[PDB]
A paper describes a structure:
Gram-positive pili differ from those of Gram-negative bacteria by the presence of covalently linked subunits containing a conserved LPXTG motif or a variant of it. In [name], the genes coding for the pilus are contained in a 12 Kb pathogenicity island (the rlrA islet), consisting of seven genes of which rrgA, [name], and rrgC encode LPXTG-containing proteins. Only [name] is strictly necessary for the pilus formation while the other two are ancillary proteins. Here the crystal structure of the RrgBD2–D4 backbone subunit fitted into the EM reconstruction of the [name] pilus reveals for the first time the polymeric architecture of a Gram-positive pilus indicating a head-to-tail organization of individual backbone subunits.
A further crystal form designated RrgBD2–D3 (residues 141–592) was also derived via the construct design process. Crystals grown from these constructs belong to the monoclinic (space group C2) crystal form and diffracted to high resolution but lacked any ordered electron density outside regions defining domains D2 and D3. Because of the close packing of the molecules in this crystal form, it seems very likely that crystal growth occurred after a degradation event during the crystallization process. The first 262 residues (184–446) form a dual domain (D2 and D3) made of two β-sandwiches of approximately 100 residues present in all crystal forms. The C-terminal β-sheet of domain D3 contributes one additional strand to domain D2 completing the 4-stranded β-sheet of the β-sandwich. Domains D2 and D3 are oriented together in such a way that the six loops form a flat relatively broad surface of >5000 Å2. The helical component in domain D2, one 3–10 helix and a short 6 residue stretch (aa 283–289), is consistent with that found in the eukaryotic IgG immunoglobulin fold.
Author numbering: 187 to 448
Write the structure that this text describes.
């Protein structure tokens, strides 16, 4: 039995029945504090080595550091039950062994809820949505995967993906398989290009992109490999490290959107 996940605004996330109109961006004004929640259902009798949530958001949403709260069945986790790392554009939250004990080997489905807020800022452009992207990276083996980090192309409209490969221990290995990625508009959600990295190559470039738009390369699941998207350092460059973790593909919830008008 697979875990299930949903992401939405406060009070609206529901993995069993995601919100029917979530495709429509919710209208906000610059300065609004927007409240989010990620709800995950973990099956009875789980034995995960890793339960990790990774969240990043587009530049018009300023992640509000210090606002992350996490509960299991509506009981707040103790500090030692999880490890949270917050960065400018989002966060990563992983259960420790103490936290895993509260969701593994249970006799009924367990519900994890993570809440936080972000602020709509003056980088937002009227009529153009802002969004976020989350993964639940899990498995019976340790998992090293996480969520895509959106990036703009360089000034010439070029965006280059560089890929490396390591085994479960983090040691370099040859490419495991041909790797396909969907380049998605990170704000609006549509696929703009699909690229393929053959096993004799480590880079691929997409040309002719909008230098003012944030995009993300989303790796199509490669059996036995998890995708570790590196932090962004440079417009026009995205790096991914594939780990041979031998785990199931991650969960990737449908995403809510916000927008502002003039």
């Amino acid at each position: 039995a697979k875990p299930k996940i949903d992401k939405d605004f406060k009070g609206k996330a529901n993995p069993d029945t995601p919100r029917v109109d979530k495709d429509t961006p919710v209208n906000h004004q610059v300065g609004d504090v927007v409240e989010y929640e990620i709800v995950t259902k973990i099956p009875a009798l789980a034995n995960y080595a890793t339960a990790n949530w990774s969240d990043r958001m587009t530049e018009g949403l300023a992640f509000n550091k210090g606002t992350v709260k996490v509960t299991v069945d509506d009981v707040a986790l103790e500090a030692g039950d999880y490890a949270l790392t917050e960065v400018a554009t989002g966060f990563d939250l992983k259960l420790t062994d103490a936290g895993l004990a509260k969701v593994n080997d249970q006799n009924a489905e367990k519900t994890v809820k993570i809440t936080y807020s972000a602020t709509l800022n003056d980088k937002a452009i009227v009529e153009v949505p802002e969004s976020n992207d989350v993964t639940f990276n899990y498995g019976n083996n340790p998992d090293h995967g996480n969520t895509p980090k959106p990036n703009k192309p360089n000034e010439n409209g070029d965006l280059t993906l560089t890929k490396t490969w390591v085994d479960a221990t983090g040691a370099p290995i040859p490419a495991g398989a041909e790797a396909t990625f969907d380049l998605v508009n990170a704000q609006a959600g549509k696929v703009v290009q699909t690229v393929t990295l053959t096993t004799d190559k480590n880079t691929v470039t997409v040309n002719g992109l909008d230098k003012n738009t944030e995009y993300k390369f989303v790796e199509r699941s490669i059996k036995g490999y998890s995708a570790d998207y590196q932090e962004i350092t440079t417009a026009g460059e995205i790096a991914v490290k594939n780990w041979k973790d031998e785990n199931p593909k991650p969960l990737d919830p449908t995403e809510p959107k916000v927008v502002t008008y003039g």
